[PDB]
Amino acid sequence: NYGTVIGIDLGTTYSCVAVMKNGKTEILANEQGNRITPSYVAFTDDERLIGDAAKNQVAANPQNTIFDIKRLIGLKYNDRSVQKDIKHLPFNVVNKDGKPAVEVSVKGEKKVFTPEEISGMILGKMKQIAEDYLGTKVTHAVVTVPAYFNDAQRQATKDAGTIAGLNVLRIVNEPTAAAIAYGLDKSDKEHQIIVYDLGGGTFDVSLLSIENGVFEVQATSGDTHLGGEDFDYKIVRQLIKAFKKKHGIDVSDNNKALAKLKREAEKAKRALSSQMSTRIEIDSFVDGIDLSETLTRAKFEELNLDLFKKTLKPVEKVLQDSGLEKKDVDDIVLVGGSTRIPKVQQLLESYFDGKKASKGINPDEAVAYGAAVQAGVLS
Numbered sequence: 475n476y477g478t479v480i481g482i483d484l485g486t487t488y489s490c491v492a493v494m495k496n497g498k499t500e501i502l503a504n505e506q507g508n509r510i511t512p513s514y515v516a517f518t519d520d521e522r523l524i525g526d527a528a529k530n531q532v533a534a535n536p537q538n539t540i541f542d543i544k545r546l547i548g549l550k551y552n553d554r555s556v557q558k559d560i561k562h563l564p565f566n567v568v569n570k571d572g573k574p575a576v577e578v579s580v581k582g583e584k585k586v587f588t589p590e591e592i593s594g595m596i597l598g599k600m601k602q603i604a605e606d607y608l609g610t611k612v613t614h615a616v617v618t619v620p621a622y623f624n625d626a627q628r629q630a631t632k633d634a635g636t637i638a639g640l641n642v643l644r645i646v647n648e649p650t651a652a653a654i655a656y657g658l659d660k661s662d663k664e665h666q667i668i669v670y671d672l673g674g675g676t677f678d679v680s681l682l683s684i685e686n687g688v689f690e691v692q693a694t695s696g697d698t699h700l701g702g703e704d705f706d707y708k709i710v711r712q713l714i715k716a717f718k719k720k721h722g723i724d725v726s727d728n729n730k731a732l733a734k735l736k737r738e739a740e741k742a743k744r745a746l747s748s749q750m751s752t753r754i755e756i757d758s759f760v761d762g763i764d765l766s767e768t769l770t771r772a773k774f775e776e777l778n779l780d781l782f783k784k785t786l787k788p789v790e791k792v793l794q795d796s797g798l799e800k801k802d803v804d805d806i807v808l809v810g811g812s813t814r815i816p817k818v819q820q821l822l823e824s825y826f827d828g829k830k831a832s833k834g835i836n837p838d839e840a841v842a843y844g845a846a847v848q849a850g851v852l853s
């Protein structure tokens with residue numbers, strides 16, 4: 475007995491849980507009412523914090539707040555990518571039996587956790603959310619991974635499930651999950667699908683073929699270090715410059731101030747997806763002095779245009795590797811939170827000669843949605 479099988483997008487920066495129950499697939503909000511949950515775990519003297527609460531206290535506890543664990547899962551310590559990644563992480567990463575693991579303080583003493591264990595904490599939260607939603611136990615799940623993940627990375631994700639008390643019945647590719655969400659599995663002919671996925675930390679482009687219900691990953695490309703967080707940082711840098719100009723206070727080496735800027739920068743960015751201008755305000759920012767700035771959409775676009783344009787290169791590469799033309803693409807699936815940015819949509823549409831991308835499904839949720847659809851077949 476599988477019970478009610480749930481779908482989980484275990485993302486680099488955010489996680490999302492969904493379930494198909496009686497003819498409807500829904501995305502399930504957490505206890506704070508958020509339909510997506512930060513992929514964060516924090517260890518304090520009292521509390522193991524998971525999700526929103528963990529991300530909220532990051533500045534107060536940077537050495538014991540874990541994020542970007544997906545960058546380490548299923549890999550070896552001496553991997554080129556791992557060595558590069560651990561330089562930019564504020565918490566301690568150690569070599570444990572040839573594999574990267576996080577080192578924190580739990581009781582006042584050093585404790586080591588595997589990426590499987592950390593991911594398992596996040597998956598456990600997703601499970602608990604689903605259990606309240608359904609009013610029943612949950613034992614089985616479908617969990618998504620990037621198309622380029624290898625067996626070690628897929629198995630580690632399954633193992634994270636096991637720690638969370640979840641039997642992960644299927645590991646499913648993220649772009650495929652998105653395509654399934656849009657019902658592109660049910661085509662009456664052959665189609666080539668481009669999935670453009672711009673998230674918080676990573677950018678992914680994949681070409682999928684679909685034939686009589688069978689998906690194949692034809693080509694993948696992207697940038698593992700290009701996402702929404704990078705767009706936030708450009709705003710952060712402008713705010714540092716502005717506050718220094720006005721008040722003679724440079725916050726470049728003030729981590730708590732920088733974290734406040736990062737939070738407000740992300741808020742401003744989100745606002746500029748639907749507004750032309752926004753107010754960035756922090757009361758009593760440094761030394762009782764208020765931060766009060768304005769950011770326009772035009773300026774945000776100006777600051778990020780080069781990064782936005784960088785996304786078109788992997789799209790070109792995917793078409794070249796598969797040997798297809800732009801006109802040969804039947805569907806463009808826009809997923810990932812950052813695809814809400816008007817300029818991103820504009821640049822992708824103009825690249826495909828005016829072809830409209832499919833964006834009707836909430837881009838934060840499409841992957842989890844598709845996971846839940848596939849899970850529904852197993853229920």
Ligand SMILES: Nc1ncnc2c1ncn2[C@@H]1O[C@H](COP(=O)(O)OP(=O)(O)O)[C@@H](O)[C@H]1O
Binds near residue numbers: 743815
């Ligand atoms: N309305 C919006 N406008 C611009 N960016 C957004 C918006 N909503 C969410 N984002 C960004 O999407 C990113 C998260 O992407 P998402 O796909 O949800 O997670 P992940 O990349 O972990 O799978 C964050 O950088 C967030 O700021």
Ligand SMILES: [Mg+2]
Binds near residue numbers: 485486673810841
């Ligand atoms: Mg994602």
